[PDB]
Amino acid sequence: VTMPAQHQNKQPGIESLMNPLPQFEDPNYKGSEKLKGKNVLITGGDSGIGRAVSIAFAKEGANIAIAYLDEEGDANETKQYVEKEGVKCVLLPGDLSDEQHCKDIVQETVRQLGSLNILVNNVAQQYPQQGLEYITAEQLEKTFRINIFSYFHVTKAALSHLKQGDVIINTASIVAYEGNETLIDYSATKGAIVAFTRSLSQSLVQKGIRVNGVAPGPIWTPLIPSSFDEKKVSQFGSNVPMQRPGQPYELAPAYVYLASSDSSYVTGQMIHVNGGVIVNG
Amino acid sequence: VTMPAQHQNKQPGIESLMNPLPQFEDPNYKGSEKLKGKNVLITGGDSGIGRAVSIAFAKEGANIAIAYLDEEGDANETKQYVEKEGVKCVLLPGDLSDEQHCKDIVQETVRQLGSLNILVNNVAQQYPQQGLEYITAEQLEKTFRINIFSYFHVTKAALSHLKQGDVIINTASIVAYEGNETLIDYSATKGAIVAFTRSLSQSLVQKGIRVNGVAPGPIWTPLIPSSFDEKKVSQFGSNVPMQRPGQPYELAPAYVYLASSDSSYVTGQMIHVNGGVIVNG
Amino acid sequence: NFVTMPAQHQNKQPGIESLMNPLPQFEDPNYKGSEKLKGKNVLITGGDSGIGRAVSIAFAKEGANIAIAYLDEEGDANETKQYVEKEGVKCVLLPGDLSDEQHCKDIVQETVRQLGSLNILVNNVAQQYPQQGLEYITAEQLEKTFRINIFSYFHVTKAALSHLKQGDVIINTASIVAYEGNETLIDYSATKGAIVAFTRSLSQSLVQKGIRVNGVAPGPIWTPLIPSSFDEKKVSQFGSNVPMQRPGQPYELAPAYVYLASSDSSYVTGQMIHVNGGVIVNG
Amino acid sequence: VTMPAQHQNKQPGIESLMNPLPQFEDPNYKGSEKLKGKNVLITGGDSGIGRAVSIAFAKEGANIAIAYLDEEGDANETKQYVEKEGVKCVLLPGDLSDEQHCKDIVQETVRQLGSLNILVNNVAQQYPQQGLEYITAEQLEKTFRINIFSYFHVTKAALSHLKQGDVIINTASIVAYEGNETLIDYSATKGAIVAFTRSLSQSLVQKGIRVNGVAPGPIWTPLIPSSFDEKKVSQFGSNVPMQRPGQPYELAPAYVYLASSDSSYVTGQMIHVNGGVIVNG
Ligand SMILES: NC(=O)c1ccc[n+]([C@@H]2O[C@H](COP(=O)([O-])OP(=O)(O)OC[C@H]3O[C@@H](n4cnc5c(N)ncnc54)[C@H](O)[C@@H]3O)[C@@H](O)[C@H]2O)c1
Ligand SMILES: NC(=O)c1ccc[n+]([C@@H]2O[C@H](COP(=O)([O-])OP(=O)(O)OC[C@H]3O[C@@H](n4cnc5c(N)ncnc54)[C@H](O)[C@@H]3O)[C@@H](O)[C@H]2O)c1
Ligand SMILES: NC(=O)c1ccc[n+]([C@@H]2O[C@H](COP(=O)([O-])OP(=O)(O)OC[C@H]3O[C@@H](n4cnc5c(N)ncnc54)[C@H](O)[C@@H]3O)[C@@H](O)[C@H]2O)c1
Ligand SMILES: NC(=O)c1ccc[n+]([C@@H]2O[C@H](COP(=O)([O-])OP(=O)(O)OC[C@H]3O[C@@H](n4cnc5c(N)ncnc54)[C@H](O)[C@@H]3O)[C@@H](O)[C@H]2O)c1
Ligand SMILES: [Mg+2]
Ligand SMILES: [Mg+2]
Ligand SMILES: [Mg+2]
Ligand SMILES: [Mg+2]
């Protein structure tokens, strides 16, 4: 029993309802201008991993545009932490399962921030089921529409604003590599993201645009209590070698590494931040 | 230059119009009852790799149900090769982008053959584009609906008919592992298939149903001249270490291995038949 | 974990199959040969027992003549020889220590002499010495493990090259541990990772000469390497950890080798066939 | 052609003899106390990647013990850069192909620095040959003794001194994943390092010691002109998608990430810094 049994009825989950509250910030973390003056669009940056990435990026001197569905309280709080760092922050609520909106958040980021340098595709929804026979066509399509189609549409719109030295980071998952028997459709979307990352990296390498991914293991975020039942929530992260789930702040440095010139010779790759699970990486 | 320059105007391609005709049968291949009495459903079994698999399976004593879109001439020919081995063959035309049709082919297979033992998900369409900006939502969704959603729907319908000792094989692609800059959407669907394979193997292992895949490299099939330009077609397969594309007959024994009790201790895996491209396999 | 086999241990490695309970199953009674390797001449190191015995017998059933190299298990090599010859093919026994370079050369020369040529090489010998941690791995054990597990693959394969031609094949036995790691077999796993990279590199080296190079990565297989390396407790629960919740039998590995050794895998080189009870290795 | 044709008649190579000199430092690199007060032992830290790692670690506040064979000029030069950052630097020459020396460098590091927190195993030699027949047993054993046996011996001796929160990083290579036809023995040592990394991570996880690796692609270091011929040297790095070899400084931030608390949820992994080569990572 790593975490207290709990569950939220609607997804996307709300961070402010969780106990304990995910740690999205490392108090000892010191920014060093790794992304100074850079303009970022992070989808799903209002909470969980996205929140921790937004704040770390702001600490590194980046201006952050945060897209999210409707978690206004969570998004505002994230905006407070971001602006505390003295950079610009824009909130872009809306449903990214709609192509047009995927285009709109990109246009809006460029209008308010002035330009776009770094795109972090990170939104997701997950609907556990005991087997394939319990996955309806409706859930299948919905899961793909937000998990992978949004990555295509937002990235596609961002391409007319990206130039040499710019970067794309996609949040995938350990399940793309290891599979998950109770998240078959979700896993398929994550495998799709991994192949997307690989192919797009090769497509944009000569344009000087790098494309990489982060594959988290079990991280304590609103996705967990809003998708899994209480029993499972209580044992979350107990399966990995470190015997604990990760906290969102533990993911941020991977994104900072991939987003900055620190990884100038890196494209088409995945950073596995998963508590010790070996994936032939 | 490996093949003569040629291009077919519509996809799915027609095998009888190709020069040279793919070699779908190994003259020296000797069946040994590896699948005697087994009932098989293979989607996309009318031509290319599926055609070679259908025929090898028939030489191994299995009854074959073949689903395909509308290539009646190719399907008919495949049927004559299968029947020559003295087994049953059932042709199932129709559009597998429709969920109900996915369910119907499974029901029809059971009706005609009596039961279902081996499912081979193998249908695909691919639409090369010079970059992500040239992929419409229409193309993206179409590509996913046939390449991965059909694998989900057909397999889901098959589950109520599969029992201990039964088997699922999914055709993926080298592109899920290596990426392909001109087939970003298609590669994404193949990455989805890889993860699907891994998750489903874990879901069904205690039910005694194995699930594996085959990742071909460049194989001479109707998919090639129906998707790529005449120039690309003429050099097809010159990029791999063996410096030639594979022939469909060269894929069939991997499917035989995975379909039979020869691989009784194998599940969740991928067989790479690609002319020597190293994929950290 | 749970008990999958009777508790047992052999305080001598390489292990002896005739002492095991139950005897591993190295033959599928229902397996039907179909001349996939008719007239081929094979050299298999460690072909006297476990996986190697199963491969020898299956290859014989496919029409291949088998030269079997092993260390000192004459009882096992002879019994294997009986099974091979029962399939109506030739069998040559090649005892000796493959941790010695010259002997690696000699077994190749001998094979060509008695069989007349060499078409297929299966590098399969291995020793393993579990330790609870790296601090318990001596330099002695380290070098010994490498010398037999990977140096012999280099030396035997190297000697085989002047005899292999277009259409010939090399198969190397690796292990799931090269992919997943194994905390109690750190040096062994390092030798298996070395074999994976050797397989990949050599495949590219020989592709234009028409010689294919592939490997098989077994999971937990009930063979003499198990009771002779692990303690009784560990042996009793062997194979309980994998998704299929059981160890594999040696006969369950042979068809992968047949696939890789024959023309059935003509468009395959540089690859690994994972036969491990369902462990996902990002394969 | 990427570099000037050049070649050194002895290995390990000497960095001061190279044209152009490898860039081991990013002038705009800003340290942020990521490793403040940490005590590091780096084998092969005198030149190439190791030099860039030593210097970046010094900028992050770490004290550096540098082991190397006998390249005293290079080691002294690296020492000056390290000490410029106000941290301690210890030089430890000697042949790590000897087990006792491997133990001695660890004992010496602990004596000079007070403790050991981070071990970077990075030493290597490589002897290209046109084929397996051209690899003598002498070369094979030499290659393994330094490339992998030293990693075992040095790490083994370090275990007495490592506790919760400490870290091991091993330098592997892309060749372990992709293979290399002219570096068959070397590649096998690097494949050994990958498996070593994975197994040791699982062995040490409950002790709170993380173990990860870095797999570089073609990096311009003394190893290159000292092993490859002038023709090959001149075209070095032109094979990867970014169409250039990497510079040592582009490797340092990955080591910084893996060495610091920034990767607290990362063990058993590999960071691929290779100019865009996809390796199913
Ligand atoms: N254990 C884990 O948390 C875990 C493991 C592996 C991967 N991931 C990945 O982490 C990423 C971030 O998720 P998280 O765990 O931080 O949880 P999260 O709930 O905090 O973040 C997901 C975000 O996606 C956004 N979103 C969902 N549907 C949307 C829609 N229709 N339109 C616009 N935005 C929408 C929400 O605003 C939400 O905040 C996801 O891609 C997820 O797949 C998470
Ligand atoms: N170079 C290659 O040929 C190559 C490489 C990697 C993977 N593959 C895979 O091999 C598999 C078989 O393709 P192939 O190369 O043999 O070409 P193929 O054209 O011979 O087979 C593909 C089949 O898919 C079927 N299909 C397409 N759309 C359909 C739909 N709407 N409804 C029902 N059926 C439909 C067609 O009947 C067609 O015969 C595919 O999954 C493909 O992705 C091929
Ligand atoms: N669970 C498993 O059994 C398992 C798992 C993964 C990989 N493998 C691999 O399978 C292969 C065969 O092993 P097995 O499990 O069948 O056990 P096995 O003991 O039956 O076969 C190994 C053989 O290696 C030979 N050998 C050992 N030292 C030798 C030496 N010094 N000189 C010459 N020959 C020597 C012995 O003759 C022995 O018969 C090995 O490469 C092993 O690493 C086994
Ligand atoms: N293109 C590349 O440079 C490339 C590619 C992939 C991996 N790598 C890896 O990078 C690591 C660093 O090498 P590099 O390229 O920075 O070259 P380098 O020559 O600058 O560093 C290697 C160091 O190993 C040390 N060394 C060699 N033999 C020794 C011995 N017997 N005893 C003690 N020390 C010894 C030398 O002091 C030398 O400085 C190596 O592990 C190498 O395999 C390099
Ligand atoms: Mg949220
Ligand atoms: Mg067709
Ligand atoms: Mg034996
Ligand atoms: Mg040096």
CATH at residue C1: 3.40.50.720
**Which of A180, A199, A204, A211 to probe the B interface (max B CBs under 10 A)?**
A199
Largest pairwise CA distance in chain C: 50
Q: Which residues of C touch D280 (CB under 8 A)?
A: 282
**Which of C192, C200, C214 to probe the D interface (max D CBs under 10 A)?**
C200
From the list B132, B137, B195, the residue facing A191 with the nearest CB is B195
A271 close contact with D: CB closer than 8 A: yes
Q: Is residue C188 annotated as part of the catalytic site, yes or no?
A: yes
Ligand 1 pocket test, pick from A98, A123, A224 with the greatest ligand atom count within 8 Å of Cβ, gives A123
Ligand 3 atom closest to residue C99's alpha carbon, by position in its atom list: 31
**Which of B177, B194, B277, B278 to probe the D interface (max D CBs under 10 A)?**
B278
Q: Which residues of B touch C256 (CB under 8 A)?
A: 257, 262-263, 266
Do A201 and B179 meet the contact criterion of CB atoms below 8 Å apart? yes
CA nearest to B271, candidates B206, B220, B197: B197
D263 close contact with A: CB closer than 8 A: yes
C-alpha distance from A58 to closest chain C C-alpha (Å): 35
From the list A32, A243, A254, the residue facing D30 with the nearest CB is A32
Q: Cα of D194 to ligand 5 centre, how many Å?
A: 37
From the list B206, B246, B278, the residue facing C270 with the nearest CB is B278
CA nearest to D219, candidates D165, D255, D261, D168: D255
Residue A232 annotated as part of some ligand binding site:
no
User: Given the DSSP bridges, would you call strands A63-68 and B39-43 parallel, antiparallel or unpaired?
Assistant: unpaired
Alpha carbon distance B75, B67 (integer Å): 9
Integer-rounded Cα Rg, in Å, for chain D is 17
- Active-site positions of A? 186
Q: Which residues of C touch D147 (CB under 8 A)?
A: none
Q: Which residue reads 């690097």 in tokens?
A: D190
Beta strands in D153-274 (DSSP E): 167-171, 210-216, 270-273
Sequence-distant (6+) residues with CB within 8 A of C188 are C126, C128, C129, C145, C149, C175, C177, C182
Q: How many domains does chain A have?
A: 1
Any ligand 4 atom below 6 A from CB of D219 = yes
Residues 177-216 of B with CB under 8 A from A: 177-185, 187-203
The token pair at C179 is 């992919």
Alpha carbon distance B67, B162 (integer Å): 18
Q: Cα of D125 to ligand 4 centre, how many Å?
A: 6
The token pair at A239 is 């399966």
Resolution (A): 2.0
Sequence-distant (6+) residues with CB within 8 A of B101 are B94, B95
SS (H, E, C) chain C: CCCCCCCCCCCCCCCCHHHCCCCCCCCCCCCCCCCCCCCCEEEEECCCCHHHHHHHHHHHHCCCEEEEEECCCHHHHHHHHHHHHHCCCCEEEEECCCCCHHHHHHHHHHHHHHHCCCCEEEECCCCCCCCCCHHHCCHHHHHHHHHHHHHHHHHHHHHHHHHCCCCCEEEEECCCHHHHCCCCCHHHHHHHHHHHHHHHHHHHHHHHHCCEEEEEEECCECCCCCCCCCCHHHHHHCCCCCCCCCCECHHHCHHHHHHHHCHHHCCCCCCEEEECCCCCCCC
SS (H, E, C) chain B: CCCCCCCCCCCCCCHHHCCCCCCCCCCCCCCCCCCCCCEEEEECCCCHHHHHHHHHHHHCCCEEEEEECCCHHHHHHHHHHHHCCCCCEEEEECCCCCHHHHHHHHHHHHHHHCCCCEEEECCCCCCCCCCHHHCCHHHHHHHHHHHHHHHHHHHHHHHHHCCCCCEEEEECCCHHHHCCCCCHHHHHHHHHHHHHHHHHHHHHHHHCCEEEEEEECCECCCHHHHHCCHHHHHHCCCCCCCCCCECHHHCHHHHHHHHCHHHCCCCCCEEEECCCCCCCC
Q: Cα of C144 to ligand 2 centre, how many Å?
A: 50
Ligand 4 pocket test, pick from D68, D119, D121, D141 with the greatest ligand atom count within 8 Å of Cβ, gives D68
Helix (H) or strand (E) holding A74: helix A72-83
Full DSSP string of D242-263: TSS-B-GGGTHHHHHHHHSGGG
Q: Cα of C221 to ligand 7 centre, how many Å?
A: 14
Q: Which residue reads 């879901």 in tokens?
A: B203
Sequence-distant (6+) residues with CB within 8 A of B174 are B215, B216, B217, B218, B272, B274, B277, B279
The DSSP call for residue A205 is G
Alpha carbon distance B72, A70 (integer Å): 51
What length does chain D have?
A: 281
Alpha carbon distance B155, B199 (integer Å): 13
Residue B262 annotated as part of some ligand binding site:
no
What length does chain A have?
A: 281
Question: Quick check: A195 and B196 CB within 8 A?
Answer: no
Helix (H) or strand (E) holding A68: strand A63-68
B279 close contact with D: CB closer than 8 A: yes
Annotated binding site of C for NAD(+): 48-49, 51, 71, 73, 97-98, 124, 126-127, 188, 192, 221, 223
From the number of C-beta atoms within 10 Å of its C-beta (0-12, 13-18, 19+), residue B34 rates as: buried
Do B225 and B7 meet the contact criterion of CB atoms below 8 Å apart? yes
Residue A38 annotated as part of some ligand binding site:
no
The residue segments making up the domain with residue A156 are 1-281
Residues 153-182 of A with CB under 8 A from C: 177-179
**Which of D203, D204, D265, D271 to probe the A interface (max A CBs under 10 A)?**
D265
Compare all CA atoms of chain B with the CA of A202 and give the residue at the minimum distance: B181
Residue B249 annotated as part of some ligand binding site:
no
Q: Cα of D230 to ligand 7 centre, how many Å?
A: 48
3-state helix, strand, coil in chain A (%, to 5): 45, 15, 45
D99 close contact with C: CB closer than 8 A: yes
CA nearest to D34, candidates D201, D271, D252: D252
Ligand 3 atom closest to residue C238's alpha carbon, by position in its atom list: 1
Ligand 2 atom closest to residue B47's alpha carbon, by position in its atom list: 20
Do C100 and C73 meet the contact criterion of CB atoms below 8 Å apart? no
Residue A113 annotated as part of some ligand binding site:
no
Breaks (C-N over 2.5 A) in chain D follow: none
A204 CA to centre of own chain: 21
Alpha carbon distance D254, D243 (integer Å): 21
The amino acid sitting at B2 is T
Question: Quick check: A205 and D242 CB within 8 A?
Answer: yes
* C-alpha torsion sign, points D189, D191, D193, D199: negative
Which protein residues are within 6 Å of ligand 2, measured from CB? B 12-13, 44, 46-50, 68-69, 71, 95-97, 122-125, 146, 171, 173, 216, 218-219, 221-224
Do D278 and B179 meet the contact criterion of CB atoms below 8 Å apart? yes
Which residue owns the Cα nearest ligand 4 atom 7? D173
Question: Quick check: C265 and B246 CB within 8 A?
Answer: no
C-alpha distance from D222 to closest chain A C-alpha (Å): 19
C-alpha distance from B29 to closest chain A C-alpha (Å): 35
Ligand 1 atom closest to residue A49's alpha carbon, by position in its atom list: 16
The token pair at C258 is 């047949």
* C-alpha torsion sign, points B105, B106, B109, B110: negative
